[PDB]
Amino acid sequence: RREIKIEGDLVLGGLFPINEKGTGTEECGRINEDRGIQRLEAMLFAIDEINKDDYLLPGVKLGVHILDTCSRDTYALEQSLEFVRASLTQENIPLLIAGVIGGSYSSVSIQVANLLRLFQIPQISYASTSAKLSDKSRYDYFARTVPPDFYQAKAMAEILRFFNWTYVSTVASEGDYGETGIEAFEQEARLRNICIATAEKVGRSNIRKSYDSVIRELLQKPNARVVVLFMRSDDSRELIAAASRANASFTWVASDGWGAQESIIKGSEHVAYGAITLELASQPVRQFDRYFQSLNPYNNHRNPWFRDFWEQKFQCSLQNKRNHRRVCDKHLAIDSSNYEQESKIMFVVNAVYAMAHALHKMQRTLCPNTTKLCDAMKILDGKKLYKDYLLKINFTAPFNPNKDADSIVKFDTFGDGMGRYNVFNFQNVGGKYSYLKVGHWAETLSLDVNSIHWSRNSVPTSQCSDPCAPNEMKNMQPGDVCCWICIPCEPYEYLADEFTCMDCGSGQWPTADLTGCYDLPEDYIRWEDAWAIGPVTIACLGFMCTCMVVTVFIKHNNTPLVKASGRELCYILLFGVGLSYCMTFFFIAKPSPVICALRRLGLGSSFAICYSALLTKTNCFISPSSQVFICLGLILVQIVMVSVWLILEAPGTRRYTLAEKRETVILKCNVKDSSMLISLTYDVILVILCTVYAFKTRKCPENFNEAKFIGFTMYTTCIIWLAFLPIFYVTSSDYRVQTTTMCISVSLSGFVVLGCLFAPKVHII
Amino acid sequence: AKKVLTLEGDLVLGGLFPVHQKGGPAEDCGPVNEHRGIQRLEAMLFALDRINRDPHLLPGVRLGAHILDSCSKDTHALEQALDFVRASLAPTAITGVIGGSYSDVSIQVANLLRLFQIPQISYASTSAKLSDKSRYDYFARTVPPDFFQAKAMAEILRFFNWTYVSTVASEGDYGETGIEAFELEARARNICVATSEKVGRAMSRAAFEGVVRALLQKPSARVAVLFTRSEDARELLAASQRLNASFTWVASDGWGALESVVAGSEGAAEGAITIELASYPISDFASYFQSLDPWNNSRNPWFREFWEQRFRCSFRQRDCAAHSLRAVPFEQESKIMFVVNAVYAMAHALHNMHRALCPNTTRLCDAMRPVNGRRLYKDFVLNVKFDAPFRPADTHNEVRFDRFGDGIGRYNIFTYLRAGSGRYRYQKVGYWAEGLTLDTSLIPWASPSAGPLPASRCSEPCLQNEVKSVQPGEVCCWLCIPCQPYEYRLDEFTCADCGLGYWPNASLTGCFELPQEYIRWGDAWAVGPVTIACLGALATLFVLGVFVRHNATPVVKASGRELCYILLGGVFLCYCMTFIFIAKPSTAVCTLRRLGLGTAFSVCYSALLTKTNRIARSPASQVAICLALISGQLLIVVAWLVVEAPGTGKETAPERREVVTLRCNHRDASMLGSLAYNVLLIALCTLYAFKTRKCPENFNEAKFIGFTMYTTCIIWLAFLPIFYVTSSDYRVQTTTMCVSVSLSGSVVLGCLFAPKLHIILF
Ligand SMILES: N[C@](CC1c2ccccc2Oc2ccccc21)(C(=O)O)[C@H]1C[C@@H]1C(=O)O
Ligand SMILES: N[C@](CC1c2ccccc2Oc2ccccc21)(C(=O)O)[C@H]1C[C@@H]1C(=O)O
Ligand SMILES: *[C@@H]1O[C@H](CO)[C@@H](O)[C@H](O)[C@H]1NC(C)=O
Ligand SMILES: *[C@@H]1O[C@H](CO)[C@@H](O)[C@H](O)[C@H]1NC(C)=O
């Protein structure tokens, strides 16, 4: 095999994927020029700078022990045993390894970290972004200068929140990358006010026919216009091309895998327009540019893989021993024309400097007097180096003196680097398609909206999320898990819950959304109304007129001594007229808690008193007195069952109306309307029958006037009964029927008293 | 300074035993273990030799051996385990290791060998953290884990209904995980822990006395669950003996049946229920080990050190000649069975793999040269149900691995009992193999006596009468306190304050109302009210005939006739309110009753006013004044009753005081004031009549009227003191109210009207 074993006071391990993984007889095949060779030289370049440095380990020389992992996890374990041979108590003397600057693959790093933790060897990774490595329970001597993969999920969620993109669709890929990150996105999404619409998986081993179905199932949701892509570089390229065939137009939010790469947009720049992509914020290392270009096989003997890299890159053989390859020219060299710096070069340099800084701090504390290696450094405990010194480093980037404020190299509690991501945007400048940085995410969100076009428009995706005009909108919808397009409720129904609008109170008006749970108010009849003042004055005038008759009757009751019983008949008739007149005083009052209970008793008593007086007159010293006593007893008997009707429920049970807006009800008297009219009608039918018989008979001895008066009043009772019942039977108005009966009652009272008092009026005048 | 036992064969089985004890800082490892390392290593060698000579187990394949020494340290075990991997990458490749006696050693070896696909079968590691497959993909063990004994103890406690127990833990690794396991199992079996505490190795006798006193803080916790080491248990027993405290200890495998724990502490250890791992001695292994000497044993490199340490001699001299293992007693290690079972399980898995890969040949298979831990482990190591080798006859023991790759939990229940002669011994009284079986006839305290140490609870369940919701600070203590009769409970958590009068009919839900109260007495006290009503009815009949001949009588004719009629009606009204008061009060009866006496005082007051008018001095004016006074008296009556809303339903004393709904909700305070105002006016009118000197005229009527008024005023002034004196007994108040109005009615008939009728009649 091949390895680098440069000697020094302290030796740092190294794991790089110089050779690409292969199949068959060859375990690893082609040389990785970018991720294997350029990263390998970055570690060597940094260590050479550290050795030449006067402030970082001036008396300690840093050696190397670098092995090729061949991009295989199993093959990395076999060479990982060489790092622990020197830790166990003469062809090849083992070298003590202070730390391992290796990784570049999550599978390689995971396997290596499992072996290194058993021997307390600190490990710093430069390209491993697996979220599994953040678990300190299984990897308690592992650190990385790059942020973990799930940090991108937090970055993508903030972009959605900034643009108010709530109803989003997530697309993942099979393996270990897609599931892990897309899983961590949901908790970050649910932490904010965002719910996932569709979850999808994309496989490597499938045909473009399945890719079309991935696109098609995304179109059967018109609202979802933004698609959170957490796919891989090759997987995302086919899906975007699939959308072109299906004529789709979506806004793509993508993580690492689709950053500023120009190999995905190819041939499908139309649908990819307006996409937002993330990429690691890596700056070029200017000093590394001259180091790599000035490397030649004739003077770079430290790297044993440089001969293979030179032959593979230029397709030439240095020693053409009858081979089918051209002889490499002596003047061949690499320049900026065909040299592009690898993206994670600055992370390799930072990882090397991180270990050197930790060792330098540990050396000073253990050896303050001297600047050389001590006997206390011979044991070289890895638990103290990692937990106490490596995790507590704080220094600026050695080769980035322009932005030292935000380029500090440090490790958090879980031994992970700071998350600084760049936000790009695929846009059309006009005749050219290219990416453009439109912000950055370093512990906070910062975007340049003015330079973002085709996404400057809000492009709402909240047709489900929250249209929710403040008409007590309810967040729910059948069939859809979290669409909740706010339709399933109405402004009349108060908002009390999310899944159900939960109307509280029938026919109730909410105040803003919930507080209107109280029942709607109602208005009763208005007191002292214009339509009530008239009858009140009429009743007062009628009562005053009857009172004047009473005063005249008693004054003129002396000379006519013949009519001994006439005064008694006049007195009871006057009392009945006064009682009937006084009925209107309280009947028209709107508040009737128990007033209506006495109203029916008063109306019945007034009718009974009038009927008793009429019956006594029709029938007609000791004998008249007995008739008055019998008539008085009949009136009392007529009131015996009057209170029986109110002996069950005088205030009533309840009062309602067909209209649910006015609700013009008494709300205090709920007696039976049918029973009230039936009793009133039955109280006048017998009066008319008894008066008709008296009219037919002839009363010669001075009783003709009484007989004529009885017959005249008979028609008035029939007319009033035949008119009061029909209006209140069907209409049942709050006040219109009440005032009509009041006018009829006072008119009837005035009519009956006029006939009885007609004869005294003529005699007096 | 390392030795290795390397046998040769087609398949090599690794081994890891604690041959040497921990050395410390002075040396890597010092003294040689005589039972944990040497005996188990010899057991593995004997099992391998038996397998190699078994025609029914790998007839062609010969099993090798590569046994190393871990020196009872995890770092040394990790360093030594880097010999199997080098062979996998003249080292001989292995198919799996059979080793690991300590939990840390096994954990480190499993962590190292998992990455290289090397299955590992342990024989003594009972760590509870080795069962999860998230970190140990190729680990198996024949011994059960340490959380099985926790649920075994939980089931033991449940069987004896020992809900209230106290647990004692240990500071080390063994002493915690078992405690959380037992706590988790106890909650699923309705078992509560009273006190939880930790005991450390460095604790002195003062700490043990303190923890014993803390255990004694709960008198109701007579059962102690000990999950500790042997030394901690021995120290706790010694501390309990010194303080002379009695407990029913329940212990795990840490105590077991060891006599060193009860060494000198037999008095306080009586009645303890300890559990130990179940195993049986192997006669074949004992015979093989007894016939072992350094001269004829060259395979074992550590045998010379073991011989030197056990038999105290040396090989530089010639003293190590006569000594032999046969003469000296030999004690077989309890876990030799597990080592043999692990070796045989590995051999059976290898045989099954060889048979499955190619049944054509019995020799090592062509395709079996590459050995993979994944397939072998998952497909054959887990699925073994072979018969236990060297097993006794009357027993059914199988070697199987569950889906966590652990052994089968089989424990023996042991008790510490005193014999008739006084000897103390541990005797098995049951076993736990996926089920608890105790005879409950050999335990010394299981005999019928005054309670077999009942550790029921902090308090007895109390649900028959009292409410058991009150707790003193612990949710498990379950005690009751009775509530007062006023506080009938309607729920299991509190006593409702509905009242004792509304006793539910054996329901205790909703506080069903009791209609029984003082509403109306049909015959208890209505007899007296009937007499007053009967007297009033007779007076009304007499009044009807009194005024029939009033016109004929000149004396009655001279007096006012209109006022005479209301006088009879006023007396008739006196008994009209009598039966209303007796009747059941309601929202309408009391209001009618309230108006009954309101107009009763109006007619009598008007009678006095009209009487004074005749003395001072007409019928038209007299009837006008009385009508106005009656209207005026009734004017304030209607206004007063609407001030307070009347209703039904009154509260009274608890315990069925029978005073519920005695009177309606209308307040009677205003009624007393209304009648008092008119009483003074009536009295003043009577006094004014006596002032006039018109004695010669109408002397007979004036004297009767004055006497009647004087009696009424005297009687009225006497009712007021007795109303406030009682202030209760509504039935008595109703009774004295009926007699009060009747007395006024009785004297009303005895007024000046009575002599007028007597003269006319006579
Ligand atoms: N940083 C990576 C990220 C890697 C990855 C990146 C994009 C797409 C798929 C994908 O596969 C997974 C799966 C799980 C974890 C990490 C990854 C690493 O290996 O950790 C890798 C780029 C680094 C390098 O090889 O230089
Ligand atoms: N079986 C044991 C159990 C062991 C143990 C047993 C009793 C008291 C203390 C104690 O220390 C711990 C701590 C944690 C886990 C297991 C134990 C093992 O090592 O797993 C160990 C007896 C086996 C042997 O060393 O031969
Ligand atoms: C997102 O909505 C908030 C208010 O809900 C608003 O202030 C902000 O400007 C919006 N961002 C956009 C439209 O990009
Ligand atoms: C435990 O209680 C059960 C009833 O729940 C009883 O049958 C059993 O005998 C009790 N165990 C004893 C008393 O040891």
Residue numbers in the entry:
A (entry chain 3): 30 to 118, 135 to 665, 682 to 826
B (entry chain 2): 22 to 110, 132 to 659, 675 to 819
What do the authors of the reporting publication say about this deposited model?
In addition to homodimers, these class C G protein-coupled receptors (GPCRs) were shown to form heterodimers as well.
Upon binding to the orthosteric antagonist, the two VFTs in the mGlu2–mGlu3 heterodimers adopt a similar open conformation with a common dimer interface formed by the top lobes. Each of the three cryo-EM datasets of mGlu2–mGlu3 in the presence of the antagonist LY341495 yielded two inactive structures with distinct TMD dimerization patterns. In the map of mGlu2–mGlu3 bound to LY341495 only, some densities were observed in the same sites, but did not allow unambiguous modeling of cholesterols due to poor resolution. In contrast to the heterodimer mutant that lacks the inter-VFT disulfide bond (mGlu2(C121A)–mGlu3(C127A)), additional cysteine substitutions of the two residues at the extracellular tips of helices III and IV in the two subunits, respectively (dimerization mode I), substantially increased the dimer proportion.
